Design a protein around this motif. Structure first.
Motif, PDB file in Angstrom:
ATOM      1  N   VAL A 230      33.215  40.330  34.820  1.00  0.00           N
ATOM      2  CA  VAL A 230      34.400  39.545  35.166  1.00  0.00           C
ATOM      3  C   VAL A 230      35.679  40.155  34.599  1.00  0.00           C
ATOM      4  CG1 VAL A 230      33.644  37.239  35.836  1.00  0.00           C
ATOM      5  CG2 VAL A 230      33.473  37.936  33.440  1.00  0.00           C
ATOM      6  N   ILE A 231      36.687  40.285  35.459  1.00  0.00           N
ATOM      7  CA  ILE A 231      37.977  40.855  35.081  1.00  0.00           C
ATOM      8  C   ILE A 231      39.093  39.831  35.280  1.00  0.00           C
ATOM      9  CG2 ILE A 231      39.667  42.722  35.519  1.00  0.00           C
ATOM     10  CD1 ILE A 231      36.966  43.686  34.237  1.00  0.00           C
TER      11      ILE A 231
ATOM     12  N   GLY B  87      42.339  38.284  36.174  1.00  0.00           N
ATOM     13  CA  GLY B  87      43.378  38.593  37.149  1.00  0.00           C
ATOM     14  C   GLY B  87      43.967  37.339  37.763  1.00  0.00           C
TER      15      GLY B  87
ATOM     16  N   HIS C 260      43.483  29.859  35.137  1.00  0.00           N
ATOM     17  CA  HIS C 260      43.118  31.072  35.873  1.00  0.00           C
ATOM     18  C   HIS C 260      43.633  31.179  37.318  1.00  0.00           C
ATOM     19  CE1 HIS C 260      40.888  34.783  36.433  1.00  0.00           C
ATOM     20  NE2 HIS C 260      40.454  34.702  35.188  1.00  0.00           N
TER      21      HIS C 260
ATOM     22  N   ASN D 252      43.172  30.679  40.295  1.00  0.00           N
ATOM     23  CA  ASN D 252      42.143  30.379  41.289  1.00  0.00           C
ATOM     24  C   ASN D 252      41.073  29.433  40.734  1.00  0.00           C
ATOM     25  OD1 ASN D 252      43.018  31.996  43.663  1.00  0.00           O
ATOM     26  ND2 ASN D 252      42.686  33.741  42.290  1.00  0.00           N
TER      27      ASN D 252
END
Lengths: 50, 49, 50
Positions: free
Chosen positions: C18-19, C21, C44, C46
């Motif tokens: 997981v990155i 972004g 986050h 999203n």
């Protein structure tokens, strides 16, 4: 004295029932602390002057 | 370098949600909130209509 | 009993990192006092259903 006797006729022969419509509810985050404790949860959208 | 695992932007998950709506049960109070009041708790409201 | 043995194969041969972004930070003036002490500074963007 004939027009004042006529405005008394219209108020007597009245027949209307109010129906709840258009009402919306605002949030606590989106009201001034002054305009908040004056509103009872849900106002009537088409608010009148006062 | 070998490059074993690949990276992704957002994770998926194995267990998701479903719903069956009843298209005749609408409340007549169109409520409202702020924009940051919207975003965080936003798509979750439109899964539990 | 063959499909349930196959869904067990896919979860085992997994490989994902997981990155972070897209993340953004909201302000205290722009959140309900209920949705505020539930957020840890930065969410986050999203966000998922819950």
């Amino acid at each position: 004295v004939s027009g004042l006797l006529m405005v008394l006729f219209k108020v007597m022969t009245d027949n209307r029932l109010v129906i709840v419509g258009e009402t919306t509810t605002p949030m606590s985050n989106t009201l001034s602390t002054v305009v908040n404790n004056v509103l009872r949860t849900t106002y009537h959208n088409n608010v009148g002057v006062n | 370098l070998s490059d074993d695992f690949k990276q992704i932007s957002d994770p998926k998950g194995y267990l998701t949600y479903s719903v069956k709506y009843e298209d005749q049960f609408t409340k007549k109070d169109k409520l409202r909130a702020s924009e940051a009041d919207d975003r965080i708790v936003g798509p979750t409201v439109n899964l539990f209509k």
